[model samples]
Target: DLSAASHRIPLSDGNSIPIIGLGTYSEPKSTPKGACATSVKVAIDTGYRHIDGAYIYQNEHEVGEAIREKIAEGKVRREDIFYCGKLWATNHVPEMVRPTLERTLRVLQLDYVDLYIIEVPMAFKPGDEIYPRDENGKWLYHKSNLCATWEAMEACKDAGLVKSLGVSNFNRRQLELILNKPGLKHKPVSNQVECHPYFTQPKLLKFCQQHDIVITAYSPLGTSRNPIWVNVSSPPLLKDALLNSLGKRYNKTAAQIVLRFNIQRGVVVIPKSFNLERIKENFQIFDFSLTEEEMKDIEALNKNVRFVELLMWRDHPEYPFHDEY
Candidate 1:
């Protein structure tokens, strides 16, 4: 029954997010200075109101440019668009949280973002270096307490820098830490993670649903084009036989099928694409729904494969991938 591009999922804080959005992270060939801004403009022109960006993406200024231009052109209002920003690992300390968000706001040219997420559970040393390293190139990590960090995130909400707060790349245990933390003013509204048919996080999805935390699926179509983080031999989700067959049956592309699958499961999906046609096509998922049997068939494709593995970060004390969820 969830069949509209305008359909929204309510968060724990009583805020609602669009079920699908355009993810603004640039890939290999699309990393030009103004590529992200152009893509954002195209996405908004093509009817996308939800735009996702992160501080680590290093394109907040460009994203802000698009928003401003669009707003000035009478295309969309500031309040009409749902903008999301992320707090990077370098700003995880309790003291640095608000300042970092203010910086993001300044870069984004916005008064308040609709949502702000902790980019990851692990913290890096706070300073100019995003990934601090020693002489040997080993990553320097900060052991910031999660509860203290959560307190600062809560403050950002109370201060009106962000309308809602959430976490990203956090596993079930990490979420539990925040959920059970004392004096938690605002619970995380969503957990943005790498989720798709190939690596469907059923257990984690169930847990989040139980606690009313929405799961925002990033890299939902698999990171085929971005081989930097993916194995060359890794099977592509868009080319999967099952997805192709379903796409043929539904007269849709494999990308649309996979996106619809995630949406049907109640997960917000943000698929990154720089192509205008594909961006428009990605927003076309609201018109279709997969049947129960087809949903199970896609579910059977799960191999527990994770595309965004932070293996180098595995040794970090607060690394979140050790758990099954």
Candidate 2:
């Protein structure tokens, strides 16, 4: 069993984040009004301390409800949970950053979030619409001034609305852009990215470590339920023969092995699931360790494959996947 104290990863800001978090993005079919909140409560009760959420998920209200309910029940205190929220593409403008975050804070009914991140590098047109498009249906993108946006993010942290600031889906070059800023206030504490055995980012991981930025892995289980981005022919990471063999040897599930692999690399992982048994199973990985040879066997499965490829946003100038990390 995993305890909150045993699985924490230190951040650049001197705060620590839980290595394993409950990813709150439910698949479309499973996303109903109360399902997300209920699952969040279940996760908290199951010993999950980090809860990953965003404004784009369209379920922050329910997520907040779960957090509030849990605190009210005395199961955990408000300060005990590490809540992470994201700024969406639509609110990437420097002026709109705080207001959008305030809106999220209102929905979450919280004084501040433990960590806040830029959902992606690119920006959409500023408005209620998330993905603005022209008549031809091509995505209309704004020229994202990352430095200016970073300044606003700094303002949020300085104002005490968020504990630490970071970005998501940023490539090596994009990170350098922030690092090289003229007068950066607070360096990003983490970079949330898609990482799994098939798409292990060794070079990027090394770069972030050198810069003191923690890498948080999303889709760590290959996002088996997300058919929109994952092709039907693509092999599932949880079903890999090598992973199954290691699972049998370690007496753990393939999901646990995959999560443990990332954790062993010093990367934080947030595997999404609404099932009770699976949530408990994902947390049980802390009890075991994978040997170096077993780790190499998993590393050999790397094919540089990505399950969460946002190809629709490729034409945007700030697209992150073009260069080799």
Candidate 3:
């Protein structure tokens, strides 16, 4: 279990994040209560040290429960696991930030999350409402932008509410907006974005690396194809012939091939699966190595395709996809 040290990538803030993780975002309605707890526990026992969850995912309570149980059983200590939480869009305003995180901490029963990120660059109207919309059926916008929200995240780190601060769905420009802030106390240690072979973020990845910031890929095996949040209608990533062929050479699944591809590029990957077997399979990539040609072929599969577009908020002024990168 202590071997998880080799799987961790050091951060600019002196903290580290586990490269591979268990993503705990199941459909809020269809997924039963405490649904993700079993998978989280299974992942931990199988040697996974990172557990990725979000407040908007509405399942952090269960994920935290699993982490606590494992620690209680002596399977792993609190320091052994890298738990990542996210700040949702509705809590984008500066004043709402601390309370929202405190609520998650109270439910999680943990003093601090390993990493906390702004779920999206766009902001929703502030309040207790998760998704506040106007009477005219249009989504309301928060008066404050993500820059102010980031200051709040920086404050959380200072207050010991979080170990590292980051942002998700951010473009190169938005990262600069924060990096060049007049008096930035903490630069984002990582940028969690939707990246896969089809949507290889070459430029953004290089930009983050040049700045000593890590890139955490959310949809490394492509978005799980739930037409709701996934916008691109392109082909399934796991069904690609080239990837499948490469998988055969390494005796791995296509999913494993793609995950390895990103990891080799120094990008952190979090692929979500509630299944026990698939979770184990996803963690087996470190055993084999992909050749340079194989890596090149995989990189060539990029089509600039993005499946997780957050289309509902595309009209927001701070929508990140507006920047080509």
Candidate 4:
């Protein structure tokens, strides 16, 4: 449905991101090659203007190919598309920032991404390995200076490599560190985080809203049941009887209801799907709206549960989840 494609949320900066975007991540080894590309192209044909990706995902080449092919086929122009890339944890070091982003552009074969964000507040030891761990199996944690990293992000903004700057998986305190940076040039326009009915970040959402920062909800439909990243014990979100009942009222899928819930709350959603039908189904949300009372009822399902805990990196010094929103 192009209905959602027409909806855009304003950011603190001049940039505005689409209300619904395609999340282009799949389990690393599980997805066959070109699956991400096929999904991106399908999403574009289905009227998805925003694409969320990261270096860690290791599928930008395919994602970029799909975007470029769509553009070449006269489906959409570069300016009409809002592609977001992330600065991986390993590249949080200031000097490494530009090169990594440049590398992304090189792989994407594009001039600039509409938005570039810090993948996570936590930093890993800088090097080739995406997840740098010691022989003992502990993560190699590096002390990261977020303010300095922000400075480098600001530099990327000035250099025209990225249109807007933001962060992902950052807590209120971590956001404060960047906001209160002595020479902060540009305020973060958004924060990409895991948000859904089960883990609705009410306080964090309100805090970000007050400061004019939009919250982009990754895993908005709840994550897949992948055990390595997702907590298998967490309740399946879309199957919740309440959401299904709510979906019945609007004649939409539970996935649609969950995504609409976030969009109505001013949170951007990027629900990933490799299947063509579900990709378009997720965008059908814009055709229907939830009532204020209905919204409250859906929100009451919150349990402060997290599916993608990144437990392996919990010991890192800058872990953001420990903070109370």
Best candidate according to lDDT:
4
Tens-digit lDDT string for candidate 4 (15-61) = 78899899988888788999999999999988899999987788999
Model 4 Cα shift for residue 23 (angstroms) = 0.4
Residues forming the 10-long window of minimal summed lDDT in candidate 2:
225-234
After the best TM-score superposition of candidate 1, give how far the Cα of residue 320 lies from its true spot, in angstroms: 0.9
Q: Is candidate 2 or candidate 3 better by lDDT?
A: 2
TM-score, model 4 to reference:
0.98
Q: Give a tens-digit lDDT track for model 1, residues 231-310.
A: 44557778899999999998999999999999998999999887878999998987778999999999999988788887
Scored against the true structure, residue 101 in model 1 reaches a CA lDDT of 93
Residue range 1-325, candidate 2, lDDT tens digits:
3344567878999999999999988765656779889888989988889999988888899889999999999999988899999999889889999998999999999999999999999988988888798899988899998889999999999999999899999999999999999978899989999898988998899999999999999989988646676644568778999999899988999999999999988889999887878988898887789999988989889888678778888889999988887
Go through the candidates in order and give each one's C-alpha lDDT: 0.88, 0.89, 0.88, 0.90
- Residue 255 of candidate 1: its Cα lDDT? 93
Worst 10 residues of 1 by lDDT: 224-233
| Over 4 Å off, model 1 | 3-5, 27-30
Which residue pairs show backbone clashes in model 2?
none
lDDT of 3 by residue, 1-325 (tens): 2134378888999988888999988888888786699999999988899999987788888998999999999999999989889888888889889998899898889999999999888888778788888899889886546678889999999999999999999999889999998899999999999899999899999899999999999978887799877865789999999999988888899999999998888889999999889999999888877889889999999988789877778788888897888
Residue 252 CA displacement from its true place in model 1, Å? 0.7
- Output the worst ten-in-a-row residue range by lDDT, candidate 4: 1-10
